């Protein structure tokens, strides 16, 4: 049946090439050329993690015959309270090596060995605020012992962690902020989410200026609210046998907050 | 009967001429020509052992009318905790000589004797991490005193064992990495298994995106998982009177991983 397959995509996640993502990708290209360590900051659900993943994918590992892969961009997200051993494990496993049993000293030396030769040139640490205060020293040592641009990604929660160590603060001072959208950029984004993401059976014409108040009141300009609303409404509409997102559905979803 | 004949075939093993096999063979040919010692490292079930077997079969012993055979490539897998006498016994029996009862010194001198005259150019030691640490000295002496390219094969556990002895580490510094399959290479490998390995009466259409999705999730790029899933799925399918693998049987197998 048709409806269950639409639900199976609408409960999924997708990537939309917003201009915010483009702007980050030009910036990360400049940092990767300069090997410039830096940070990406901005409120929750602003699209940072999805923009970072899109950068990983477009700069995927290149295979070379019988060599370790060339992996220009390594993306990791630490587990909470990430120590040095946890950091080294995530980096080495990302490069498709297996960690052996060993000391932190073994893990460090093995990680530095494979950060070389795999030709890593950027390290993106998402949820960089999950790093333990002692493991930033190893992150800093990677940044300056190798020609690697380390990009710390977090919310303003990260800046509190950063400013608690002036050696971290002074290495990651350069920054880019993901902001909330508004106005015509929000209108174009809302238009994109109808006509590119949902691709629903019958249009709702989400350029409409009045219902844009309903979105704004729930969405506050968070993309990660906007993308949530429409999938909730569309699944309900297609569950209810409505070929469009009706106002009665959008406002009911937007009322759950 | 048809069924038991097909089951007896699928139960077995075979060698598929994957590109990573050819890559290793050309590299081993270079190392053998130069008599350079080296190591082969890669994740478990990535195909290292089959590729090393395929090499020594392409370079099997040559008879010369009542001389001992010219045997340019020796392949051994040591048993666990292989001591020096075990190692010498492995090598001697490969060259078609019987080990007479004697001391380790007698075994060493006899092995050194028959590595000459058989004209051994390359010695491949698979599961080289099973060697006792004292046994590496005798492996180094074979590389040093005879002009023999010794190739250590193992997983990342070998790379840790080797780094516990600078004299071994510094001799086997050159390496080849065996990788997992992914992407287009994995899609071609699935196509080859359907055509060249399983050889069912009817096309299983394993190139299909829905089939690749199942296979990619369960195989994770390990050629060992790919082989042992598809053979078992074919055996299950034939046992049910199906003339091909189907999604339901394939999912039923893949669910066990």
């Amino acid at each position: 049946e048709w409806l269950q397959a639409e639900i199976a995509r609408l409960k999924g996640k997708s990537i939309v090439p917003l201009q915010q993502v483009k702007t980050l990708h030009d910036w990360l290209d400049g940092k990767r050329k300069a090997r410039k360590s830096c940070r990406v900051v901005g409120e929750s659900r602003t699209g940072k993690t999805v923009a970072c993943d899109a950068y990983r994918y477009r700069h995927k590992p290149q295979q070379e015959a019988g060599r370790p892969p060339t992996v220009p961009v390594v993306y990791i997200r630490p587990h909470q309270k990430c120590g040095p051993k946890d950091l080294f494990k995530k980096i080495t496993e990302y490069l498709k090596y297996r960690v052996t049993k060993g000391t932190v000293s073994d893990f460090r030396d093995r990680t530095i060995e494979v950060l070389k030769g795999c030709g890593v040139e950027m390290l993106i640490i998402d949820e960089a605020d999950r790093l333990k205060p002692e493991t930033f020293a190893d992150v800093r040592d990677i940044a300056e012992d190798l020609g690697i641009a380390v990009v710390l990604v977090g919310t303003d929660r990260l800046d509190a962690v950063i400013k608690r160590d002036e050696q971290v603060l002074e290495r990651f001072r350069a920054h880019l902020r993901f902001g909330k959208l508004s106005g015509e950029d929000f209108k174009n984004t809302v238009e994109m989410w109808e006509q590119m993401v949902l691709k629903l059976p019958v249009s709702s014409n989400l350029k409409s200026k009045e219902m844009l108040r309903i979105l704004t009141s729930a969405t506050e300009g968070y993309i990660g609210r906007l993308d949530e609303i429409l999938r909730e409404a569309a699944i309900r509409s297609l569950s209810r046998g409505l070929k469009k997102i009706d106002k009665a559905v959008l406002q009911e979803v937007a009322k759950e907050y | 009967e048809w069924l038991q004949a097909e089951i007896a075939r699928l139960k077995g093993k075979s060698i598929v001429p994957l590109q990573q096999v050819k890559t290793l063979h050309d590299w081993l040919d270079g190392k053998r020509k130069a008599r350079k010692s080296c190591r082969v490292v890669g994740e478990s079930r990535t195909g290292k052992t089959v590729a090393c077997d395929a090499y020594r079969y392409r370079h099997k012993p040559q008879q010369e009318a009542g001389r001992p055979p010219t045997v340019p490539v020796v392949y051994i897998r040591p048993h666990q905790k292989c001591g020096p006498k075990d190692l010498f016994k492995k090598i001697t029996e490969y060259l078609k000589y019987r080990v007479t009862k004697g001391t380790v010194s007698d075994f060493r001198d006899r092995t050194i004797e028959v590595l000459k005259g058989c004209g051994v150019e390359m010695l491949i030691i698979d599961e080289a991490d099973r060697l006792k640490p004292e046994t590496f000295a005798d492996v180094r002496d074979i590389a040093e005193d005879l002009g023999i390219a010794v190739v250590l094969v193992g997983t990342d556990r070998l790379d840790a064992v080797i780094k516990r002895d600078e004299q071994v580490l510094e001799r086997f510094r050159a390496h080849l990495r065996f990788g997992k399959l992914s992407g287009e290479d994995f899609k071609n490998t699935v196509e080859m298994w359907e055509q060249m390995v399983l050889k069912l009466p009817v096309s299983s259409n394993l190139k299909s995106k829905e089939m690749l999705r199942i296979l990619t999730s369960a195989t994770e790029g390990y050629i060992g998982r790919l082989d042992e899933i598809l053979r078992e799925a074919a055996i299950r399918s034939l046992s049910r009177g199906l003339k091909k693998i189907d999604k339901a049987v394939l999912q039923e197998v893949a669910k066990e991983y």
């Binding site: 999924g12 996640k13 997708s14 990537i15 939309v16 090439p17 993943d53 899109a54 990983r56 994918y57 995927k60 590992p61 590119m196 993401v197 | 992914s182 992407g183 690749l212 999705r213 990619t216």
Partner: peptide, 13 residues
């Protein structure tokens, strides 16, 4: 254009 995390897992992976 839009992409699926599951496609990207195969395609780039």
């Amino acid at each position: 254009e839009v992409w699926d995390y599951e496609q990207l897992r195969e395609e780039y992976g």
